[PDB]
């Protein structure tokens, strides 16, 4: 029965690909070369940088380093607004609440720590610690000041209630380590990519997997939602990125090149969704054209692998964080 | 039984031909092309990271 | 005076040296070889991003010193012979002081490398800090002291006022200046030897206290120290002895003092040996080369 | 009116970051690894005199942080690189696991599983210049067992006599042969027991040896 179910899924999918994305997008003008330069350089981390996340104001950002520091920067002036001494230095992810009041991080401690930034004293206290995951913490993203979603190496994702500190919902069904997650703009769905080489779309309200997407031949390390919420992009260890559309339940475009054989560490879109920025293990970040399968730029300024990558909500700047301990704002 | 149950719920789903999805993506990208700084280099006066 | 062409004639006549060669060809070839080796070393410390730690600046400083010494020896071979008498005493002093400055710089760079190494093995710190204050202090003292020591003869302190005190080797130098230079060389040699002996002693004594089950780094270290010190002394001992003898022997007494080019070419040869010694034993430079 | 205060606060933060980094650079980092039923807990218990456990101990004017990651059932290739840069790896094997089968209980000899793990870790691309301290545990229990059940049950190709010294050295050699990076890193070995009182000393000497070697490599002398 399972074999026939898979065959039916395959046939109902192949009956939808009347024409490849490249055909319909064939004639639109190419973006041409994209050239961005390093307008800032943030210094102060003394180890590898593993994650960064822009604030919603597009000015402040948080970076997590294995030096055991969570640093909140003002990217305009480069002033360090805050420096938080994490209890566990083996951090892998960090998030900035949409309201600018809280930050989150976590990692090999299997805990999601939540820190309050706006306090009467004026110092940053630890506000909450979320402890129900059995593997390490790969990614975390607030929904508001009281709800956060986490993905774990234990092959599960969770929706938490920060006030009570309890897992409100659990998302099971992945077979490998879940490595990244991206909330939908509306905040009602979210996609997760795992080491089983598949992505899954989850309904936050209900707690069930709505769709599964396959095609990658290795781990999915990064996943980003397209701006309009009807598509997403996955970057993998097979040196490929791919673009999936929820309503088609099928792979549309695949961004790869022979000269590229390393892994992908992070993916993001530009504010219009026209550019797909992908960090790589070979110390670079490629600027793909999402609609047309053609590379259109390189952000080459780091000495070690580009571990993290982000775009501001206003779309003005890009942020690259690297194992070489430096962050760069690109424009 | 759990695996077949999940797949069976993923089969009876309203799909669309990929051409429609490609058209939607292309249209959305075209509609917001005039507001993407990284795509259309903004004047230096209005860019907060230059002056 | 300093613009009289008769002074050089007068001094060379007093020291018995009043007169292109074949040996110049082979010597210039050796100089080209040394220049090429040191250019390769300099190009390697620049291309590889890993080589930006303080210790690598000291190696490149030595490479620059040896390159300068090769260039100076080339120029001194080109401008010597019959071009000496077509030379002003100011030009003569420049020609000789160039060699003095370059070789002094190379020896001081060797001492600088020894001091860095002895500081690093004395700290025994898990990460070695990319300190720049001593790296600037030491690499500048080298060149400054070299220029001052090798500039003294032109700014006075020479044999021009009185012909009695003239070395047979450089007839326009004052024997006391050569004595000063040989003493400085002796101090530098003793410093380098003692520094590397203390480095080896540290490594060996620290390794002795460790208790494993049934040396390896305390024997290869001894071999490297032996190579370094032995090559240095072997290349620089003939010329040092020659100049001591010159300060001793009176004019027109010692014939050996006339064929002093062989000693000089050996001392410059040390500059070619330096890149091999400080790149082959690294066992990380070799990989970066290819 | 506020930019001056902002710049002052940033400079203070830079000060504290520099001071914390300098303090952290003077600490030895040890990654603890081993199979399930090894004597890892014994090593940690005698060296102190849900996620990742850190143990800080100071010995002979030298501060060590040992990180135990035994409670990570997730795939190791996703987080092993996080430990690139540790001073050393402590790896624990149980000499008594040679006659024991795994939870499969069909043919998976425990000692073979430990050998596979050691081979994976030693030759891993992230640990090429990082040394391994090997602790062979349970030596008394092993000594007792090998009086009854011949070693041949593991390593069928072993003609040596059934005595503690011979077979113990044999297994030490079997583990040290799996090293392929035989030029870049060392493998220090030490036969632990239930109570020895000198395992901290052995780790100290191993880290000192590594420190001296790394210093010689910071000069051009190695
Ligand atoms: C006739 C051969 C000849 C010889 C020389 C000599 C003697 N250079 O000596 C360099 C030196 C440089 C540096 C030092 C040390 C000082 C202390 C610190 C460490 C370095 C010493 C020292 F002495 F100290 F060891 C010596 C120069 C030019 C010519 C060739 N000229 C052309 C020929 C002609 O025309 O006949 C004369
Ligand atoms: C060399 O010196 C002697 C004595 O000082 C002098 O008589 C002779 O003319 C000099 N030779 C030349 C070529 O000037």
- Find the residues whose C-beta lies inside 6 A of ligand 2: C 9, 13, 18
What CATH number did the domain enclosing C78 receive?
1.20.1070.10
Rounded CA-CA distance A225/A229 in Å is 6
Q: Strand pairing of D27-34 and D88-94? A: parallel
Question: Distance from D100 to chain A by nearest Cα, in Å?
Answer: 28
Let me know if C3 is exposed, middle or buried by CB neighbors in 10 A (0-12, 13-18, 19+): exposed
Chains near C, with 3+ CB pairs < 8 A?
D
What CATH number did the domain enclosing D139 receive?
3.40.50.300
Contacts of residue A99, defined as CB under 8 A and 6 or more positions apart, other chains included, come to A56, A144, A145
Q: Please state whether at least 3 CB pairs lie below 8 Å between chains B and D.
A: no
- State the virtual CA torsion across A70, A76, A79, A84 in degrees, nearest 10: -20
Bridge partners (DSSP) of residue C120 are none
Structure tokens, B34:
């005039």
Let me know if C132 is exposed, middle or buried by CB neighbors in 10 A (0-12, 13-18, 19+): exposed
- State the virtual CA torsion across C205, C208, C209, C212 in degrees, nearest 10: 150
Residue D104 belongs to a domain: yes
Name the residue range of residue C12's domain: 5-289
Do C221 and D28 lie within an 8 Å CB cutoff? no
Tell me if residue D101 falls in helix, strand or coil. Answer: strand
Cβ–Cβ under 8 Å, residues A28 and A293:
no
When scoring B25, B33, B34, B36 by the number of chain A Cβ atoms within 10 A, the one with the most, hence best to mutate, is B25
Residue D18 belongs to a domain: no
Chain A, window 272-331: residues with a beta carbon less than 8 angstroms from a chain D beta carbon? none
Nearest Cα to Cα of residue A193 among A161, A240, A228, A148 = A240
Which helix (H) or strand (E) segment holds residue A209: the answer is strand A209-214
Which helix (H) or strand (E) segment holds residue C257: the answer is none
Let me know if B10 is exposed, middle or buried by CB neighbors in 10 A (0-12, 13-18, 19+): middle
Cβ contacts of A71 on chain D, cutoff 8 Å: 17
Structure tokens, C108:
């001081």
Tell me if residue A17 falls in helix, strand or coil. Answer: coil
Nearest Cα to Cα of residue A302 among A276, A269, A325, A270 = A325
Helices D110-122 + D164-177 axis angle, to 10: 40
Rounded CA-CA distance A276/A254 in Å is 12
Bridge partners (DSSP) of residue A328 are A41, A320
Q: Please state whether at least 3 CB pairs lie below 8 Å between chains C and B.
A: no
Out of B3, B26, B29, closest to residue A24 by CB: B26
When scoring C206, C212, C277 by the number of chain D Cβ atoms within 10 A, the one with the most, hence best to mutate, is C212
Contacts of residue C121, defined as CB under 8 A and 6 or more positions apart, other chains included, come to C199, C202, C203, D212, D215, D216, D219
Rounded CA-CA distance C247/C167 in Å is 6
Bridge partners (DSSP) of residue A94 are A105
Ligand 2 center to C9 CA (angstroms): 9
Q: How many domains does chain B have?
A: 1
Positions at the binding site of C for sphing-4-enine 1-phosphate: 95-96, 232-236
Ligand 2 center to C12 CA (angstroms): 10
- Find the residue in A nearest to D4 (Cα): A79
Q: For chain D, first and last CA: distance in Å?
A: 56
- Nearest-5° angle of CA C107, CA C110, CA C112? 110
Do A13 and B15 lie within an 8 Å CB cutoff? yes
Structure tokens, A61:
């950002």
Residue D146 belongs to a domain: yes
Residue D220 belongs to a domain: no
User: Of the bound ligands, which one is closest to the alpha carbon of residue C107?
Assistant: 1
Q: How many domains does chain D have?
A: 1
Question: Distance from D201 to chain C by nearest Cα, in Å?
Answer: 9
Rounded CA-CA distance D199/A155 in Å is 38
- Nearest-5° angle of CA B46, CA B50, CA B51? 70
Residue nearest to atom 10 of ligand 2 (CA): C13
Cβ–Cβ under 8 Å, residues B32 and A30:
no
Rounded CA-CA distance A59/A57 in Å is 5
Ligand 2 center to C246 CA (angstroms): 22
Question: Distance from A92 to chain D by nearest Cα, in Å?
Answer: 9
Contacts of residue A64, defined as CB under 8 A and 6 or more positions apart, other chains included, come to A49, A50, A51, A52, A70, A86, A91, A92, A93, A94, A105
B-side interface with A, Cβ within 8 Å? 3-4, 6-11, 13-26, 28-30, 32-33, 35-39, 42, 47-50
Strand order in the sheet with A38-42: A38-42, A327-330, A318-322, A306-311
Structure tokens, C158:
């020479």
- Method used to obtain the model: cryo-EM
Cβ–Cβ under 8 Å, residues A321 and A63:
yes
Cβ–Cβ under 8 Å, residues C243 and C178:
yes
Let me know if A11 is exposed, middle or buried by CB neighbors in 10 A (0-12, 13-18, 19+): exposed
Do D213 and C128 lie within an 8 Å CB cutoff? no
Contacts of residue A259, defined as CB under 8 A and 6 or more positions apart, other chains included, come to none
- Find the residues whose C-beta lies inside 6 A of ligand 1: C 17, 76, 80, 84, 96, 99-100, 103-104, 107, 169-170, 181-182, 184-185, 188, 239-240, 243, 260-261, 264
- The distance between the two most distant Cα atoms of chain D, rounded to a whole number of Å, is 84
Breaks (C-N over 2.5 A) in chain D follow: 49
Nearest Cα to Cα of residue A26 among A292, A252, A207, A309 = A292
Question: Distance from A44 to chain D by nearest Cα, in Å?
Answer: 7
Which helix (H) or strand (E) segment holds residue C145: the answer is helix C133-151
Best of C4, C9, C13, C15 to mutate for ligand 2, by most ligand atoms within 8 A of CB?
A: C13
Rounded CA-CA distance C200/C207 in Å is 11
Nearest Cα to Cα of residue A142 among A124, A122, A117 = A117
Cβ–Cβ under 8 Å, residues A38 and A329:
yes
Structure tokens, A77:
């002036």
Tell me if residue A283 falls in helix, strand or coil. Answer: coil
- Find the residue in C nearest to D221 (Cα): C282
- Nearest-5° angle of CA D67, CA A67, CA D86? 40
Q: Domain ranges for chain A, please list them.
A: 1-330
Q: How many domains does chain C have?
A: 1
What is the CATH class of A1-330? mainly beta
Do B49 and A5 lie within an 8 Å CB cutoff? no
Best of C28, C82, C103, C263 to mutate for ligand 1, by most ligand atoms within 8 A of CB?
A: C103
Rounded CA-CA distance C148/A109 in Å is 62
Cβ–Cβ under 8 Å, residues C196 and C229:
yes
Q: Strand pairing of A209-214 and D88-94? A: unpaired
Nearest atom (ligand 1) to Cα of C12: 36
Contacts of residue C46, defined as CB under 8 A and 6 or more positions apart, other chains included, come to C60
| DSSP structure string for A297-324 | EE----SS-EEEEEE-TTSS-EEEEETT
Structure tokens, D179:
């090293």
Cβ contacts of D28 on chain C, cutoff 8 Å: 126
Rounded CA-CA distance A323/D141 in Å is 45
Tell me if residue A74 falls in helix, strand or coil. Answer: strand
Which helix (H) or strand (E) segment holds residue A49: the answer is strand A49-54
Strand order in the sheet with A209-214: A178-183, A189-194, A198-203, A209-214
Tell me if residue C36 falls in helix, strand or coil. Answer: helix
Rounded CA-CA distance A308/A93 in Å is 10
Rounded CA-CA distance D203/D135 in Å is 10
Nearest Cα to Cα of residue A105 among A116, A115, A118, A120 = A115
Rounded CA-CA distance C59/A312 in Å is 46
The structure tokens 């606060």 sit at D9
Nearest Cα to Cα of residue C232 among C275, C267, C184, C280 = C267
Positions at the binding site of C: 95-96, 232-236
Out of A245, A311, A317, closest to residue B49 by CB: A317
Structure tokens, D23:
């303090």
Question: What count of residues does chain B have?
Answer: 51
- Nearest-5° angle of CA A109, CA A114, CA A119? 145
């Amino acid at each position: 029965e399972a074999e026939q179910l898979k065959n039916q899924i395959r046939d109902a999918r192949k009956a939808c690909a009347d024409a490849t994305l490249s055909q319909i997008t064939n004639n639109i003008d190419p973006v041409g070369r994209i050239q961005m330069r390093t307008r800032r350089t943030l210094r102060g981390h003394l180890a590898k940088i593993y994650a960064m996340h822009w604030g919603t104001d597009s000015r402040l950002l948080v970076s997590a380093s294995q030096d055991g520091k969570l640093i909140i920067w003002d990217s305009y002036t480069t002033n360090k607004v805050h420096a938080i001494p994490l209890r566990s230095s083996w951090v892998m992810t960090c998030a900035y609440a949409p309201s600018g009041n809280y930050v989150a991080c976590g990692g090999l401690d299997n805990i999601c720590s939540i820190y309050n930034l706006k306090t009467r004293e004026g110092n940053v206290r630890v506000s909450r610690e979320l402890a129900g995951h059995t593997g390490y913490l790969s990614c975390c993203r607030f929904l508001d000041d009281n709800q956060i979603v986490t993905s774990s190496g234990d092959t599960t994702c969770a929706l938490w209630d920060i006030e009570t500190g309890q897992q409100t919902t659990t998302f099971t069904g992945h077979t490998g380590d879940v490595m990244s997650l991206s909330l939908a703009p509306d905040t009602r769905l979210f996609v997760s990519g795992a080491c089983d080489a598949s992505a899954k779309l989850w309904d936050v309200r209900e707690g069930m997997c709505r769709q599964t997407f396959t095609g990658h031949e290795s781990d999915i390390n990064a996943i980003c939602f397209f701006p309009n919420g009807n598509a997403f992009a996955t970057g993998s260890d097979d040196a490929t990125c791919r673009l999936f559309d929820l309503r088609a339940d099928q792979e549309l475009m695949t961004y790869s090149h022979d000269n590229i054989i390393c892994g992908i560490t992070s993916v993001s879109f530009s504010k219009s969704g026209r550019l797909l920025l992908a960090g790589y293990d070979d110390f670079n970040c490629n600027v793909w054209d999402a609609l047309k399968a053609d590379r259109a730029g390189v952000l080459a300024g780091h000495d070690n692998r580009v571990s993290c990558l982000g775009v501001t909500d206003d779309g003005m700047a890009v942020a690259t964080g690297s194992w070489d301990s430096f962050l760069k704002i690109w424009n | 039984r759990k695996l077949v149950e999940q797949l069976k719920m993923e089969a009876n789903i309203d799909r669309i031909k990929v051409s429609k999805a490609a058209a939607d993506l292309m249209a959305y990208c075209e509609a917001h092309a005039k507001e993407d700084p990284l795509l259309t280099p903004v004047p230096a006066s209005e860019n907060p990271f230059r002056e | 005076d300093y613009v009289n062409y008769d002074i050089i004639v007068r001094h060379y006549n007093y020291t018995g040296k009043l007169n292109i060669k074949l040996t110049s060809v082979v010597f210039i070839l050796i100089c080209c070889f040394i220049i090429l080796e040191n250019i390769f070393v300099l190009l390697t410390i620049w291309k590889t991003k890993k080589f930006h730690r303080p210790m690598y600046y000291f190696i490149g400083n030595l490479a620059l010193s040896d390159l300068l010494a090769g260039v100076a020896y080339t120029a001194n071979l080109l401008l010597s012979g019959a071009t000496t008498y077509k030379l002003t005493p100011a030009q003569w002093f420049l020609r000789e002081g160039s060699m003095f400055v370059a070789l002094s710089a190379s020896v001081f760079s060797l001492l600088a490398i020894a001091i860095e190494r002895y500081i690093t093995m004395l700290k025994m710190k898990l990460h070695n800090g990319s300190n720049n204050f001593r790296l600037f202090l030491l690499i500048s003292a080298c060149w400054v002291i070299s220029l001052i020591l090798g500039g003294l003869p032109i700014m006075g302190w020479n044999c021009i006022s009185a012909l009695s005190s003239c070395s047979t080797v450089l007839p326009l130098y004052h024997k006391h200046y050569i004595l000063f230079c040989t003493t400085v060389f002796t101090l530098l040699l003793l410093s380098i030897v003692i520094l590397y002996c203390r480095i080896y002693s540290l490594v060996r004594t620290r390794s002795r206290r460790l208790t494993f089950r049934k040396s390896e780094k305390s024997l290869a270290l001894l071999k490297t120290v032996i190579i370094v010190l032995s090559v240095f002394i072997a290349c620089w001992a003939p010329l040092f002895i020659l100049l001591l003898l010159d300060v001793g022997c009176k004019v027109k007494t010692c014939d050996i003092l006339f064929r002093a080019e062989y000693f000089l070419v050996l001392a410059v040869l040390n500059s070619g040996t330096n890149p091999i010694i400080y790149t082959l034993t690294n066992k990380e430079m070799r990989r970066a080369f290819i | 009116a506020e930019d001056k205060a902002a710049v002052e606060r940033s400079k203070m933060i830079d000060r504290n970051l520099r001071e914390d980094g300098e303090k952290a650079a003077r600490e030895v980092k040890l990654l603890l690894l081993g199979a399930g039923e090894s004597g890892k807990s014994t090593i940690v218990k005698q060296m102190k005199i849900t996620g990742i456990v850190e143990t800080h101990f100071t010995f002979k004017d030298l501060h060590f942080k040992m990180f135990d990651v035994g409670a990570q059932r997730s795939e190791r290739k996703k987080w092993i690189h996080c430990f690139e840069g540790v001073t050393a790896i402590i790896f624990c094997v149980a000499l008594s696991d040679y006659d024991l089968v795994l939870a499969e209980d069909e043919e998976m000899n425990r000692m073979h599983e430990s050998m596979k793990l050691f081979d994976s870790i030693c030759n891993n691309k992230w640990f090429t210049d990082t040394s391994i301290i090997l602790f062979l545990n349970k030596k008394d229990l092993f000594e007792e067992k090998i009086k009854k059940s011949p070693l041949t049950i593991c390593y069928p190709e072993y003609a040596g006599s059934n005595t503690y010294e011979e077979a113990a050295a044999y297994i030490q050699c079997q583990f040290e042969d799996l090293n392929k990076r035989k030029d870049t890193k060392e493998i220090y070995t030490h036969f632990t027991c239930a109570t020895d009182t000198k395992n901290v000393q052995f780790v100290f000497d191993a880290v000192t040896d590594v420190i001296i070697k790394n210093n010689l490599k910071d000069c051009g002398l190695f």
